[PDB]
Ligand SMILES: *[C@@H](C)C(=O)c1ccc2c(c1)NC(=O)CO2
């Protein structure tokens with residue numbers, strides 16, 4: 001699975017966070033499926049600060065990056081999988097595209113930087129957890 005490395009922060013899907021993530025916790029929110037932990041090394045990624053609805057995401061289950069149009073971050077209902085239950089998720093963006101369990105954490109990027117990470121899949125839709133509202137990732 002994938003993550004964002006910005007400053008001394010590591011941004012992951014909450015349900016895939018490790019014990020080391022939880023032991024170095026900065027912030028977490030179940031409703032968004034996001035968790036941020038602290039890092040010793042500085043990261044290479046820049047977070048987008050924008051309202052773009054077009055970008056490119058990485059799909060591990062295809063070994064491919066795909067250009068997509070996506071919705072603005074919203075409170076959305078997510079169906080059950082073969083291996084997890086159904087629930088409302090907040091700050092979620094949807095696009096038409098392929099995702100499945102191996103694709104968690106793939107980056108969605110726009111011309112301004114990282115928009116979010118792959119979070120959901122079903123019925124030809126990929127959902128992304130937005131990070132562009134988390135301005136505190138840019139400092140401290
Ligand atoms: C996990 C964070 C993730 O991004 C993901 C994408 C697509 C799908 C799943 C998880 N799980 C499923 O069951 C279906 O597709």
Ligand SMILES: [Zn+2]
Pocket residue numbers: 048049050051052110111112113
């Ligand atoms: Zn942008």
